[PDB]
Structure formats: C-alpha cells, structure tokens
Design a protein around this nucleic acid. Sequence first.
RNA 1: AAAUUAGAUCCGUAACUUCGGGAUAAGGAUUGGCUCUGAAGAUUGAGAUAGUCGCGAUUAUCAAUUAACAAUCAAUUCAGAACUGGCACGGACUUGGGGAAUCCGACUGUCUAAUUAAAAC
RNA 2: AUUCUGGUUGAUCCUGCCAGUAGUUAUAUGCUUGUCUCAAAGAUUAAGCCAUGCAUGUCUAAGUACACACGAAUUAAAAGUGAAACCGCAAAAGGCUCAUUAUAUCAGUUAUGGUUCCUUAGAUCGUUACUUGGAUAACUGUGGUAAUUCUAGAGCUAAUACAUGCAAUUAAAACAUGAACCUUAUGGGACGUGUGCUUUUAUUAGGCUAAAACCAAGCGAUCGCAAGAUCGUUAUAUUGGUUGAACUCUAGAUAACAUGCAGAUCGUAUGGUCUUGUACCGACGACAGAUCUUUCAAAUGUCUGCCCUAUCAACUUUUGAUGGUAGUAUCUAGGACUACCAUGGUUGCAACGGGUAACGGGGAAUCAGGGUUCGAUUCCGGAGAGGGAGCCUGAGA
RNA 3: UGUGCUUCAUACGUAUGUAAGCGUAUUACCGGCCGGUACUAUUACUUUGAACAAAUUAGAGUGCUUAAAGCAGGCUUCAAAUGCCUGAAUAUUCUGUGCAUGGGAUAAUGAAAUAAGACCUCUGUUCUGCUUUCAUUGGUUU
RNA 4: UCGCUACUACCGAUUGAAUUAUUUAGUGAGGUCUCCGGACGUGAUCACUGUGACGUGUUACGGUUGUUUCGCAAAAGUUGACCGAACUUGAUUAUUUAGAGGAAGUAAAAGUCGUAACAAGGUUUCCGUAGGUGAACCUGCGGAAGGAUCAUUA
Lengths: 155, 261, 207
Amino acid sequence: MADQNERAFQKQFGVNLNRKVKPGITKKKLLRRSRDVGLGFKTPREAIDGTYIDKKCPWTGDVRIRGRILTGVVRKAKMQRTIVIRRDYLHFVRKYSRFEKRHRNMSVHCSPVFRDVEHGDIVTIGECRPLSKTVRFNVLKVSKGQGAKKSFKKY
Amino acid sequence: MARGPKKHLKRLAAPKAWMLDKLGGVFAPRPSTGPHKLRESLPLLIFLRNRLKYALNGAEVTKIVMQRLVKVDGKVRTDPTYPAGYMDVITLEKTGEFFRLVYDVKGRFVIHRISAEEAKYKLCKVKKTQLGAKGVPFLVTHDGRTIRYPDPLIHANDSVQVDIASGKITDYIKFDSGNLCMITGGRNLGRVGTVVNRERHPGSFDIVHIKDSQGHVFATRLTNVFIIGKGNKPYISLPKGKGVKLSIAEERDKRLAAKTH
Amino acid sequence: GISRDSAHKRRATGGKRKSLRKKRKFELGRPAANTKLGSGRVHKVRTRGGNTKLRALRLETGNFAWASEGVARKTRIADVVYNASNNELVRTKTLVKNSIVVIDATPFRQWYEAHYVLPLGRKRNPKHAQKEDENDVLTKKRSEKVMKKYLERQKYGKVEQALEDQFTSGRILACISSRPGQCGRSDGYILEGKELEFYLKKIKSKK
RNA sequence: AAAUUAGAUCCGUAACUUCGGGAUAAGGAUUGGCUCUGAAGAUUGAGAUAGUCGCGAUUAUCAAUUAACAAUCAAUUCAGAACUGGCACGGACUUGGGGAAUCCGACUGUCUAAUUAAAAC
RNA sequence: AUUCUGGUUGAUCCUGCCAGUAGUUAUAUGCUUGUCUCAAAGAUUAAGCCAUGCAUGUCUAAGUACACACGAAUUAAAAGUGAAACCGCAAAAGGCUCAUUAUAUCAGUUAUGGUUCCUUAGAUCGUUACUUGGAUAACUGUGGUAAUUCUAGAGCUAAUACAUGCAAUUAAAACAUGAACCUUAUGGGACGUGUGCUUUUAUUAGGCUAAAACCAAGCGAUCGCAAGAUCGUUAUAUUGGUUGAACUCUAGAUAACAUGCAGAUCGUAUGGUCUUGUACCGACGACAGAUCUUUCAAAUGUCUGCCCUAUCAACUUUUGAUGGUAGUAUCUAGGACUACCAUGGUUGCAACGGGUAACGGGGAAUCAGGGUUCGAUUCCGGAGAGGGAGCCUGAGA
RNA sequence: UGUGCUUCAUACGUAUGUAAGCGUAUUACCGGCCGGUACUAUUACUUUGAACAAAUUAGAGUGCUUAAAGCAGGCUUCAAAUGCCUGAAUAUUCUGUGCAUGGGAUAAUGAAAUAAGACCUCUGUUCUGCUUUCAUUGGUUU
RNA sequence: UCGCUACUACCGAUUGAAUUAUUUAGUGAGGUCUCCGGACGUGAUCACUGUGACGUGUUACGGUUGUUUCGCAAAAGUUGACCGAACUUGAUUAUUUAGAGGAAGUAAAAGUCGUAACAAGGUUUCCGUAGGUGAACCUGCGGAAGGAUCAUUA
C-alpha cells in the first residue's frame, strides 16, 4: 500500500525486528507469520510477503472470522480499505403469492491483500467484531479473481 | 446483570418436560444454579412430591432434605431445589431406593430404579480438554466436574464412567462409527443408538446420523449426542425398553388398545 | 455522567434516532487521566463488577525493556519528545500509550558490560586515559570456572551505530507500551532498528 | 436635538419579489497581551564507481530522486492551542439603530445662486 | 352452517349503493332474573392528582452476646431462651402500568475467539514472639430546637467488623551467580546467594514430510608410526489448541515489574495418649481465601422480518456524518470520545421528514378458501415511577 | 443425455412400476457383493430433516355425575397389601429468514475466438520450501 | 338570477390569540472528577523530668510535660474540567381558535322575474376557448354526434 505514511509507526503487533538475542540459532529471515483462517480460503501469497500491516485484516491482524459467511456484489469501493456491497434477494408476500425484490448494503472492510477490487465483482464476506461503527464484515474471497471478460481483449 | 439475575421463574414458563400442571400454583421450582442448566434439570421438589409422592405439600420436602436423608451423587445436597440433571444418581440408601435420572423417549425423563452395585458409578461425557489446572492437564465434564490428570487419548466428544466415591476415570468410551449413543435435547430425545456417520461442518454445528435397532435412521446435532458404549454395549442399565421409536398409533395400540383389565 | 454508547449519534443513512433508554450505567465513561510527568501519584477507581484499575495521573518512572536483549530495567522518565495522537500531549508532557519518550540509558549500560563486558559505546578518551582497573575485574577467567562464557559471544556485541551514538549521550529514545490511565504504570520498550529511524527522522528533519 | 448601533471573523436570516432581489434583513457568538504549533513558496537538485601524473591539480555518467530528498532563502497571511488581568479588549480613532405598514414618485439623474430639493421637471 | 332479501320503474333488464342479516373476551346501556360451576374487572378520558393503613426483612448446637429480661452456683465454659446492638446477606427479584419508542423496541436466527459476573456446585492452596493490636454500638449517664422525625457530650466492651503479623517460607531437589572444583569436549563442584502467587511490559518457542555428497573438534568408532585423517548411531526444529485458525487464548520458560493480596475464625465430640503436663488427631462450617473450570445471567453485535403518509425527493457532514490512523475512556468492540488525514455514507426496491387515537411478539375476533380488524390486559421481552438531570454503596441500580 | 435395446428382480403368452447391461472412463485404493476411502459450476424452487418457551389452537386419552374444563386416574378389587398398572400424546404454531440432505424439470448467470483455451506434449527451461540425516555441532550442496 | 329564513365550510385587516414539542445562543442549581487545602487526632522524635542501676559518663520506669525535628491519614473550604436540570430570549414546527367585511354551498317546493334544456323544445345539442349580458344564457373560432342524415348524386 503506502509505506509508513502515518504519524505513528504502523507496525505488526507481536512481531520483532531483532537478531541479537535468540535461543538456538534459527533465523530464516521471513519474520511475519500469517494466520490462515482455514475455512476453505487459501491465503494469498501477498499475505506472506506483505508490506501492509492492516490491524483489521483477518490474516495479518487481530480479527478472526466467526458467524455468518455471506456473499455480495461490489457497488462502490471508495473508502480507505473499505468497500460497500450489494446483496440482492427476494421477499415473498403471501396474499399475492408473488415475490418482492429487496436489497441491503453492507459496509465491508476490504483487506489490502485483495489488489484491484472493483464493482461489480462478486465477493464472499464473513462476520467479525465491530471494526468501525457500521463495519462488521471482512472480505474473505473476491470471487472474480481473473478477468473473465474485462482482462479479455482479442489480439 | 441489568438489575438481574432473575431469581423467580413462572409456571407455564418452566418446561413441560418435567410435566408440571398448568393449575397448581403461579410459580415453578427454579433450580439453584448447580452443575446442570435450568432447562436440563429436575429440582428436588419434583422428584419427591410430584413423582415418588413421599410428600404432598412443598413444606414436606424441606422436612426431608434438611435431615440429610437425601443424597445426590454420594454427597448429601440439602439444597431444597438442587438441579440434579442427567444421570445424577440419587442414591437413597434409606430407604434403599437407588434411582438414576435417565430421559424417556417422549422428550421427558423417566424414573428408573437401578441396581445398587452399578449405582455407585455413573457415566458422563467430556466437553473441553485444557491446560492450567493442577498440574498441567484437566478436562471438564457435561455436568462440569473438572477432574485432573486424565488419559492423553481422551479427546472431546467422548464419555468416561466416574465412580461416585472417587472422582477418577476408570473407562473411556470414545466417538467412533460403531458406538451406540443416546440423544438429549432436541425433538429426537430419549432415542438410544446407534451411530452411522457424522457430518463435520467446519464452523460450526456438526450433525450426526443415528440408526435405531428398528432400522430407523435419523439425525440430530452433535451437541445433543451422549455416548453410552460400543455396538450392542449397554454400559449402564437403561430404563423401559430402549426408546424403540414407537409409532404414534402403536402406543395407542400396544397398551391403550391391547389392554387387559 | 459521560456516556459511551449510541443513544444519541444518528444512523448510517443520516437519520436521527430519537430517544433510546433514558441513561444506563453500564455504558458510562470516565474523565481521562492526562498523566503528567509529576513524581508519584495514583488514584484507583472502582470499575465494573467489583474490580479496580489504577488511574495513574502524574507518574515519573517506568519498567522499560530493551527488546533485543530479553532485559527489562526500571528507569526514570526524562522527556516526552514525540506523540502521534496530538501535540497538546507532547507540550504538556502527558504520558499515555505510545508516546516516544526519553528515559535514562544507564541501568542498561551497567547491565550491558555485566554480561557483554566489551566496552562500547565508548565516551571521550580524555576520560578513558586510565581505568580502576576494569578489564581484569570484568572476567579474570579463573582457569577455568563459569566465566569463558563471555567470549563465545562478541557475536552479540555489535549493537548498531544509530543506537550506540544515543548511549554516549546517556539518554535514549524509548516508546511507551502501557496504558497509564488504566494499568497504573508507564512501561514500554525502546526503539532499536527501524522504529528508531522512523521516529528520529520525524524529529530532526521536521525542524 | 441628543443618545443607541457601528471595524472585522463566524453562524444565521422573514414577508413580498419584475427571481436580479429584499439583505449588512432580523438574531446571535468571537475579538487584548504573552508563549509556542500548524499550513500556504522560491533557487541551485544531489550524482554514487580507475587512477595517469605526482589523495592533489589536467580528471566520468543513462537514470532513479520520492513521498517530508537535503540544506539555503523569501515574504507575509490564515487556522489551532496553553497561560494570563477590574472583562477593561474594533479599549483612541475610524465607524449602520432596527422593524410593521400607508401615500407619492419607478429607478440613477434635474431644479427655484440669496426663504420652497419635493409628490415638481 | 362456501346462501342473501327490501328499496331507482307505468312495468323490464341492469350498474349501483342504501337498508336488512349474524358472530364478537367487545364496551357501555335499557328492562327483568329461581338456582349453580368457573370469573374478567380505573386499559381507553387524566403515565391526572391522593386522606389513612400496609406491601422487606432475616439466626443456626455452629460470626458477637456481662439484660435477672428470665434460667443455675462459686466451673472462665455460662454450653438455656436469647431481647437489644454489631457484623454477614438481601432489599437490583416480584408486583403495577403503557407515557415514551417507527429497524428503534420486538421476533427468529447466529455471535461474543469483543467482554463481564455475587451465587452455585467441582477442582485447587511452602522458597522474626505465633498466636495478636486499638475502638465503637448495644449499656450507663447528663442534654438541646416549633416539632415527634433528628442527633451531640462522657463512662463502659466485643468480633469471622477494622489493623498487624507464618522459625520449618524448608532447604536439598530446581537453578542463575560467584565458589575450595580443573579437561583436546553429546566434558565436573562443595557452599555463598537467589527462584510465592497476581498485575504490567518485553522476549523466545508455538501444534510441523525424507537423506547424503562433503567437514573442524577425531570423543563413540576406525585407520595412519603419529602429528591425525576420513566417517558415523539414536535421546536434539521435545506445550493443550478451535479438532475452521500467529485464538495476544488457557499452559510454560526468560528479563523485570510494583503492590497489593496472602486462615491471629467458629459448634459438636474427644480419645490415641497422662507425667491430666499446650508431647501426642477426628468428622463438620464458615465474615471468608485465591486461581482455573462450570452454571443463573447480562450487555453488545450478525442475518432477515414493522403501521399510515410524496399536499414529505433527495438526506448526512460547521457542533461525527462515512472511512483510515494513533490514542483516550469503558468490563470490552466501536466516531463511543480526541487529534490528524480521506471524502465519503443513505436514496423511487421510498432514504429523509411527518402522523400515529403505536409498547413489540406469543396470541385474539370473524370466514369454504384467500383474508380483514384488534392485541392496555395474567406469558416472554422492552420501558418507566409528578416532570428532567445527577449519583452513592453494591457482583448487580 | 433424450432414451432405446438387452434383461432380470415383479401386478396378472402379457404388466418393471425397485434395478442391471450398449452410446469409447457417471470418482482412485485396501478391506468381506460389502466398509474406510479421493473427489462435489452456482442461485431460485422442492423433498425430508435439524434446530428452537409454555399457555393458547389443533386435539390424544380420561365418566370432574355431564358440560366448558381439568391432567388426572385406573385396577387386584368391597381386601390384606413399595400392591401393581399406564398416564400426563402428536401437530398447526415460532407463517418466512438461516442451516443439513435428496432432486436437476422449470428459470437466470457462467465458459474456448486471430485463443493468458484444455488435457497434453509430463520438458526440467523455471519454481517456490523444510523437515529427516551431515555424533554433537559448523562449513562445502545435492 | 333575485328576495326572506337557517346551516356548514372557505377568504380576510388584525403581521391577531392560545398551545405543543424541537432546538441556536445566553445565563445557570447540583453533582462526578480534579488542583490545592489541612479543623481535629494521632503517630513519633527532640529533649526529659520522678526515682533507681552501672561507671556523677550512660540508662529503667512516670510527667495526657517542655518543645523542636518526621511523619500518617483526614473534614470544611477551594481551583479547573465534565455531566447537566432550570429559567430568559430567538427561530422552527405541529395543532386549535377570535375577526369587520367579502364570497361560494346546502336545505326550503309554498316568493319575484324570465323560460335555459328534454319533441325540429320552437335559434338542434354538447365540447374546448375567448369576450359580452339582470338571470337562465348569447356570440365568434374549432370540434363531436351522445342528431333531426348510417343514403340513394356513372
């Protein structure tokens, strides 16, 4: 993302940039571990060589997925590491036996491990602790991945 | 906590798995926070006046339990409303009674007078194996009897028989696809054995498939599943005949219609 | 009192939620600490159920830890140089969490050449023209008890250039890592490798 | 007649209306001194790597700078905070009272030098 | 117990409404009433005010008992009843009501690994007089103001109230530091020191597929006369852990930390042992103990679901609105609050505003079905005690 | 990818309504046809479930004398008699959301275009990595 | 149309009147927290005084002493913040209400005036639009048949 452009030192908690004192001799010089949330979600390679920290990321921060896993299509992606999704469904009414179409918007935290998140890509989200005032969900898998029609161009 | 914690509980709000009548009082026994939860309890005003009919008022129960004649799980338990849930061996050596609270197939419990030799141990399942209690290991039981220093092959989802004089393990029955089981908590209550297959849903709420001796395959959550031995292994005495998954009309045909009188 | 949850505070559409539950105790807030560098005060506040935390207005001393050692030597706290939350908190010398702070640099150096007897970082050699006479009362080797352990090191004793220059001045840059309004103390670690080079670029290049 | 208001910054502003207005409507808040803090510019940027000859003088370069690149230098304005006294602070001076209507003339303009400046022209 | 009749015309067939029709735990009211079983009942208007009376107090052989108030007999054991008073606990449940409240409450679902917790049960309790300090009620005694409510001054005295305080806290063992140790190595020591838990910070391991080519110590082992040279066996990436996982999580070690806390308590029996000599030990319960695990809960958050209104189309954001970031604050997440950046966020799938004679839901009334109307009302949940605000003690307001 | 044939299990030469055999391979191993076992384009719909308060409601059973109710009671029996016997159902509801499982008709989206198409040319050109052994422990490195 | 008798609802000077909640500014009771503060009530030392004891050099016990050292807490009162009732003012809503005059509607047929329409209603009617007129109505322009023509005129 941006490399320490805040007033504080944006640092990963509990990791150490230290070499002098260590029991044994065990270096291997890749010092940040990643969580794997392991719910079917292969963690990306950029959560291993990740220069971002993101204290609200579920792989490299102190949030962990629990509760509902939902899906949604992106509509706007303009906030700082935060998107909003569209979640389209139907509400059946029984004095007509027809469907009534509704939707909701969810303020969703977008981890910086997902480069190039656009609307309208499909996104699988998952519930967390209250992250900021309306956010309660992290992205877990943006379901476009490749460009199946937008990275396509003939010749 | 919000001006709590609600010391009362009403009749027609206590469960009808204890078969309380709608008239007979405004209130309900309200068990005093023991090992078992409230909706999985039988307070000792129920077991003495309503069931055994040793009393006839509510005052004639504190004139029983305060004389230390009652004995829940070897200890005395002079609490007049002790919860005393699943498989709590109420071992009355006077006047030689030796019950055990095992649950009936109709969703309810049933009075089951057991043998006095196997009364002095009971079977209980484990919930969380963890470190920290002395010295490193301990596990918690379904009633919550934390017992230290267990076998390192007892994981969760298994049961161990606890002697009532000690607090020590003697045998473990672990969760394989050959072990007969028992259900407590859902619509499938009281039905006994045997396991087929468990569907592990990662995060969360695994369900498991259970096949009765009639071939009656069904399913319930893994939370409700106790375990009481291997295939055709009753490791405790069970009550009336196993919870066969009777039909609805067959109980109206077994003894209600086919009735000698 | 001060309240902490959203009885007020209009919703995500822009709309005014009205009334919401007259005022409840369990969502209270408290007036802050603003722990200055005055020596030695603590008030303790009775908190939610039965407990107590230490509201340590006016602290002066802290259990600071050189993280690259596995050491934690208590010092006193000298100066509050930099802070990312405000500059009202630097100027009034208030200690909260991670204020960049200046401590003592002495109870680490005596601990340093206790286990790492190699003399660095060295001061002006006009003072160092004679010793009293340290290099033998350091180790003396005994021929041979416990003490050859001080020479299979020297692999550890090359603390970086931007830290040993900050030891010769006898005051070092640290960082608070406790909650002085809550934990009752102002402890912390010290800047070594790149937490240093960020927070020191923040000072002398801004001026 | 006299008093009241008055600078500036900020907020807020009705009936009507030729939609331009009315309007500085009305109505309120702020304002000194002293110590700092923030923001808004310019100009060269800054060049890393043999040694001939004896590092020294004749002596190299595509680009990447970069995310405060580093010093110099330049004016002045605007926001913020802490402390601080007889609330005296636009401390003199410079400097609008406002509003609800009726009549006449639309407006700016012109007039009886020396009694009428208007609704007259 | 899926039905319709009268009324527009001089008569007709229609559209059409009016009028009939029946039910209503649905209110009032009118007239009359011999039983009897159940029984709703100041909700509607005024959540408008209120005479009087009561609705919260509590003792075991087991915290403290100096009452002749009553028991007995020179035994301190009175172990009796125990009034009072102290201390402990409870008084935050219930009970009443429906003003407020329109995604708010509520209902279901799911979460808390984002927290907290009296009690209850279960497990757990070594790193200088060991048996103590003072001071108050009850009680006595003299008082005050219109005024009983209120309370002062003095003399007494307790504890499981308040306060201090373990010589086995006891080290070997463990293990750093020195130490009378002294050797070509997966090598050895007397002793002096130190090592409660808890909080805080910091570090390091953190749940894990297989071998050699070659090599310094050549120790195990081999060869070269040897200086030694080529090799090599295992105990050595040795902690639960969701069986979704850098759970900062319960465990552990390291380097510290400050500051507290740490069993000077009680009834019934006593004999093993008598020298009746503080040499010799049961069963019980507790103002109480501390950590972990439970449990009665809570409080937040997830995903859906609410009435009328466009003669309400754009709202939010100075004064938090949407996000980032560091903080503070709280039991904890979080614009909850602050400071600095970013300019977001909701919207014809009805946002925002308004109305409500709106507490929500279970449920109730009525029909063949589809449904309409109601739910102040005994059950769960929310809410409040003339109107607002504040707050103490308490695990909990 | 709709079925056809070959059939056989199965209502009466006829009827497959359970299934098996050809349309080149409706998922690879071991076990004694049978289990562990590797692998699941998607959503709506639908099957059966799970899961969850009671009262109400539906209503099972029952002579409170009946009844609305009630959750009791009944029997051996006029008894003596821990002397027995069984109760105290099952459901609409808490309609939908959400979860598990079967189905794949219907209805949308999805894919391979001068190929950032597939298996393959499994080439080693490139990889990533780290626990087993270099006695212990360090270097040379496959 | 007009006239008498009623009834409802409008418009309207008064920049009317009364509420109702919601807030901008202003003041402001209390309280939490905080900066100090230090009544009284101890600790405790400084000396000691009453005596004895040792070698009067030093100490033991008493004086709620003398009076300096040193604390320990702690009431009143206070400084600053923060929650904030409350009243005063302004605006904003959301209802209700008094009003000279003005003007529509309904009931009321039995009043006056004329006859607009329905019969080729005696000028066919209706519509849109303008103007005019005591009143129904009239007239222009355009339209329609719901017309009095479904039309016969190589």
